[PDB]
Design a protein around this nucleic acid. Structure first.
Ligand SMILES: [Mg+2]
Lengths: 49, 49, 49, 49, 49, 87
DNA sequence: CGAACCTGGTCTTGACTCCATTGCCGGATTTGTATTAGACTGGCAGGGTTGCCCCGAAGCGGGCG
DNA sequence: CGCCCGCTTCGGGGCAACCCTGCCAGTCTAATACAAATCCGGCAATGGAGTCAAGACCAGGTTCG
């Protein structure tokens, strides 16, 4: 009822999700266990106006 | 060795096994390609002169 | 953990280690038409016997 | 206590291998080093059996 | 039994000559009578192997 | 695994099928046909006497006579000697 | 030479019997759900104790722009 | 004037002979009330399956004038 990350592509060394998104593994474990948010997208035009 | 780590990056690269080694044919139950399993010997026809 | 503080054997633990499927059941298998006994020396036998 | 032989006896549950030990019938463990010896002879057919 | 060889293995199979086939012949008692010259090949003494 | 194949019962059952087919082939065509259709050897579903008489054009009672005769015939030791040992 | 005889299969009629097989039908049991009104408001918890090796990651000292 | 490239320290995972030979791990508000599900135990709709007993008959070796 809600998606899930595979543990093989997160916790193994080196973290393949971590390389694919260029996130540190500390950041990755902080995201995918709901410890910290992540800004998935942003605007530019409304941002500057 | 490292049955986890060897497996996952093979799965990332979609790396296709070719079944031409020696430990492969032992696993899948085919004849090994060494000794009496190569095609120089395995296709011998025998006829009685 | 399980009851009695036993770690539960997950999916990766069926392949990891000596207890994994690879080295315990894929490569080496128990064979029928087998047998076993303690040996004694046979100094009247011939070399092919 | 030590002699043992089995032509066809019980079989294991998950994988369908023969069992092990004199208490059951069981067959001798045809492990990895036996497999390397059979490959080193070049006997492919016997290893396939 | 006559003219139907059997494979003899002494565990562990350190090298290629750890498995050797022999034509059997029936012998009373309950011990595998073994030729005295292949004991170096198996590296087998008779202290209960 | 007690649920697995005993692997001598399979070859025993195949040899029993062969011996039973030989013993049924000692009979005639109507007799072996009536026996096979009575016990369901051909399909696993044993049809009953009215269907057997329908495929044989006769009464179910004639089929009962034939089945009684064949069960009398099979109970002879001349056919029973190579089948008693299969139980 | 011809006439009956008794009896095998081969088959038919019709009556009798007996048991599956639903179909209710009423009751028993059993599986799931709801509901308790004084007040209660952040856990117990040992495996860790190797050796060696490879490697990824942090962190700081070092010169540096 | 402030600012980051190599040791350097630390975490951190993988692996370290092969046969036998075994054989089964736990506890704290406790209940009602009910509705539906479902089992199940027993007569009655059969209806079809099986069964006995008599009989119709050909004709085929077998018995007789
Ligand atoms: Mg010794």
């Amino acid at each position: 009822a809600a998606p899930v990350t595979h543990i093989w592509y997160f916790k193994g060394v080196p973290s393949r999700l971590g390389y694919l998104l260029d996130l540190a593994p500390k950041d990755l474990e902080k995201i995918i266990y709901f410890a910290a948010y992540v800004i998935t997208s942003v605007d530019e035009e409304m941002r500057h106006n | 060795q490292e049955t986890t780590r060897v497996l996952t990056d093979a799965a990332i690269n979609c790396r296709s096994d070719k079944l031409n080694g020696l430990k492969e044919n032992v696993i899948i139950g085919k004849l090994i390609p060494a000794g009496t399993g190569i095609n120089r010997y395995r296709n011998i026809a025998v006829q009685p002169t | 953990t399980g009851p009695g503080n036993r770690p539960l054997k997950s999916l990766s633990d069926l392949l990891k280690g000596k207890q994994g499927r690879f080295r315990q059941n894929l490569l080496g298998k128990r064979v029928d038409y087998s047998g076993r006994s303690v040996i004694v020396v046979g100094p009247q036998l011939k070399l092919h016997q | 206590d030590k002699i043992h032989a089995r032509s066809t006896g019980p079989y294991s549950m998950i994988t369908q291998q023969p069992l092990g030990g004199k208490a059951q019938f069981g067959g001798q463990r045809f492990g990895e080093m036996e497999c390397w010896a059979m490959q080193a002879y070049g006997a492919a057919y016997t290893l396939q059996e | 039994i006559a003219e139907h060889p059997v494979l003899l293995n002494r565990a562990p199979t350190l090298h290629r000559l750890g498995i050797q086939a022999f034509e059997p012949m029936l012998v009373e008692g309950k011990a595998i009578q073994l030729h005295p010259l292949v004991c170096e090949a198996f590296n087998a003494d008779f202290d209960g192997d | 695994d007690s649920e697995a194949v005993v692997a001598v019962d399979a070859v025993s059952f195949t040899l029993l099928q062969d011996q039973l087919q030989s013993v049924l082939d000692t009979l005639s065509e109507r007799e072996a046909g009536v026996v096979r259709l009575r016990f369901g050897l051909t399909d696993g579903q044993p049809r009953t006497l009215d269907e057997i008489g329908q495929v044989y054009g006769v009464t179910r009672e004639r089929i009962r006579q034939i089945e009684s005769k064949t069960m009398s015939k099979l109970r002879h030791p001349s056919r029973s000697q190579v089948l008693r040992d299969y139980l």
